Write a protein that binds this ligand. Structure first.
Ligand code: GTP
Ligand code: GTP
Ligand code: GTP
Ligand code: ATP
Ligand code: ATP
Ligand code: ATP
Ligand code: CL
Ligand code: CL
Ligand code: CL
Ligand code: MG
Ligand code: MG
Ligand code: MG
Lengths: 247, 247, 247
């Protein structure tokens, strides 16, 4: 046989490159996943991830309470934190023993898989009682924020998209929903009658994941890297696995 | 300049009236919210609200368990109340220490924003195991109850719609889902192929809110009134903010 | 009058047969329910049921954590079980006091009502972090498993469909979503524009039920049999109520 890495008959080499290319392009096919991660960062350094993986379109919807840090199996002062909720839903509306709950997110990162079309991204960053813009009567139910999404590049390939905003002020008390649609460069509407019921089933079939990791290092190591997910850390370091045309 | 309140050149006055009119009519545009509140009233006077706010259509789905009173951070006798659940799912099916759980709702109020079309309202008021009408085989999955919805009028304007039913009998053990569609007097189908994927995204983007307020006064003060929501209290008093054509 | 059971004028007899036939065929009409049960079996003999009942289509979506046994109001070692979660999401990723959590399901049974079309059934049996097939890039978001569904026959009638798989190995750590579409032998697309918004409302109106029964006997007695649901027990015994053309 020919010698490895010296000719066009390194079929092992060609097959490796095709395997990676097939995965990248399958993901971008209408058969492929579109994935969304919402990361809530807490002052103790831990990070809640909410993930959804689905065909055609994907989303996550959270309220003020559901974004708050919960240390499973540890003390979370639930009565006091309910009083925090009451005090955040209406000024002077509760009697907690604290001014600022350390369970409040300090920041949010939204990351999409590279199979999203950024022009379809929508976000409702609402107030603490789940209104998009102060009052329902004046609220568009979303903002289209795609132009703010940064490309996560690795080795010249887009491995994902990130929108990051901090919540450093005392009044940064939010509710949050996010939605994105899978790329479709064809003119075949996946939600027209020939395929519409499959998009309804995709709403059923969407897989969700949630966990609170004790720090960003642990998240990077045992979540992001373990499962070939894209990420951007606090030092602007990019994570992900480039696949198209690559060995 | 002209003197305030004496001529057609009170532009401040005209702008105020337009601001309010724009909010009312924006809410009724296809860009606007449609909102649903389900209020569960408990014997201790507290009130659970479940709220969802979304474009195009909106709904809430609850089971017997999820409607039960939960006092966050206080004693809820969870084992005993699981035995209540077992005893309510099947007669003589549990061993709780009580005949009637005070966590059971005594009444339900359903309120829609004025941007709902009442002809589209649907409700599945089911039994304790989440069947609409005793057995699945005979169950239509909803009832269309719009004709029972009362207009909440303030200053001659419809600020919302209410359907209220008490659950005063021991056998009033329910599951509950409710759905309504945003007004659309145009013939443009928001869920036809030109816009269908946006209605799917609206399912993602819908913002939800839940809280248990200690009484109806507190609910009126720090929830309803605070956020310009419609309401009807036990004394048939109407709450809401009239906007169309008004300063 | 004629004597009972001796002539074609036993109208009581004819009405009984029609009552049962009407229920069976109503269930199969587009007005009827389609229902899904996911049963998670635990080593202590208890069984979690997740049920959804809806028009047009139905589904259930669970993650690794949500399938785990929870004994309401009893000790569940929540910190230790969070460490189990960490150790199952990534090998050697936690520090629980155990090798195998007895809260892990030992098996799953999926049962559909007889009103499902088995060709529409889809399942995403994913890994512990809610990826269908190890990595998102290579994942079709479902498998179509209808050919594996067994008919639950009683008295020669199909009363439901079952797919059952055990999880007996230590590496059988899963996430799970399932979806099925209601029979529609007509060419009228229930999700084409004439009726599409009603299918969106059906997503709102779907009723859900969850409970953990202490054993299969109790499940059979107070859940399955009580509410005329189909079932298949560990001894391959079939349960359900035959209705079509029957008294
Ligand atoms: N492209 C490129 N890579 C370099 C160079 N010098 C060092 N490198 C490293 O080599 C890596 C690329 O190697 P290859 O993947 O084999 O080269 P390639 O440009 O991708 O070409 P093919 O994969 O064969 O089509 C990069 O990730 C760099 O870190 C250079 O001059 N050009
Ligand atoms: N319309 C009306 N309001 C009265 C009358 N007497 C007292 N009011 C009070 O005045 C309020 C209405 O005042 P306005 O809003 O300035 O009058 P309007 O009828 O709405 O007329 P415009 O807003 O200028 O178009 C009502 O809410 C009443 O409580 C009356 O005779 N007619
Ligand atoms: N069909 C049938 N059933 C039998 C026979 N012997 C005993 N059985 C029992 O009788 C039951 C059926 O009785 P029926 O329902 O009155 O008879 P059928 O065949 O359904 O006929 P119709 O309901 O009158 O149309 C079955 O469930 C059997 O358990 C037999 O020879 N033929
Ligand atoms: N020294 C080099 N000279 C020429 N091309 C390079 C070199 N290093 C990498 N490349 C190529 O440049 C392209 C972009 O790779 P690069 O490493 O810059 O991506 P990146 O990870 O986004 O970079 P960075 O994260 O440092 O901004 C790839 O096609 C890669 O093969
Ligand atoms: N004394 C009055 N004479 C004439 N018109 C009035 C008077 N008070 C209010 N109105 C007008 O009548 C219309 C209805 O207002 P009204 O106060 O009756 O509404 P409402 O809050 O639904 O009343 P209620 O709650 O007392 O039944 C409004 O256009 C308002 O401007
Ligand atoms: N002894 C019998 N002779 C003839 N027909 C019978 C007899 N018993 C039942 N049947 C008929 O046969 C058909 C199938 O009934 P059967 O009792 O076999 O259903 P099944 O409950 O699926 O059976 P099994 O669970 O024992 O496999 C029905 O129409 C029934 O009326
Ligand atoms: Cl494709
Ligand atoms: Cl419009
Ligand atoms: Cl029909
Ligand atoms: Mg290369
Ligand atoms: Mg006026
Ligand atoms: Mg018979």
């Amino acid at each position: 046989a020919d010698v490895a890495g010296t000719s066009n008959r390194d079929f092992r080499g060609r097959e490796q490159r095709l395997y990676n290319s097939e995965q990248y392009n399958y993901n971008n096919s209408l058969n492929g996943e579109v994935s969304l991660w919402v990361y809530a960062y807490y002052s103790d350094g831990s990070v809640l991830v909410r993930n959804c993986n689905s065909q055609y379109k994907v989303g996550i919807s959270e309220c003020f309470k559901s974004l708050k840090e919960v240390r499973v199996g540890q003390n979370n002062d639930p009565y006091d934190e309910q009083e925090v909720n009451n005090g955040v839903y209406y000024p002077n509306g509760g009697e907690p023993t604290k001014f600022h709950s350390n369970a409040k997110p300090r920041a949010i990162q939204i990351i999409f898989s590279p199979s999203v079309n950024v022009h379809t991204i929508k976000m409702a960053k609402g107030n603490s009682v789940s209104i998009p813009k102060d009052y329902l009567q004046r609220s568009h139910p979303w903002e289209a924020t795609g132009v703010k999404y940064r490309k996560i590049h690795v080795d010249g390939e887009i491995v994902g998209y990130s929108h990051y905003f901090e919540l450093p002020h005392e009044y940064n008390s939010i509710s949050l929903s996010v939605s994105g649609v899978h790329k479709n460069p064809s003119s075949y509407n996946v939600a027209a009658p020939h395929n519409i019921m499959d998009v309804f089933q995709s709403c059923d079939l969407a897989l969700k994941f949630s966990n609170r990791y004790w720090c960003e290092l642990e998240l990077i190591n045992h979540y992001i890297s373990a499962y070939a997910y894209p990420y951007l850390d606090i030092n602007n370091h990019k994570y992900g696995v480039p696949l198209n045309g690559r060995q």
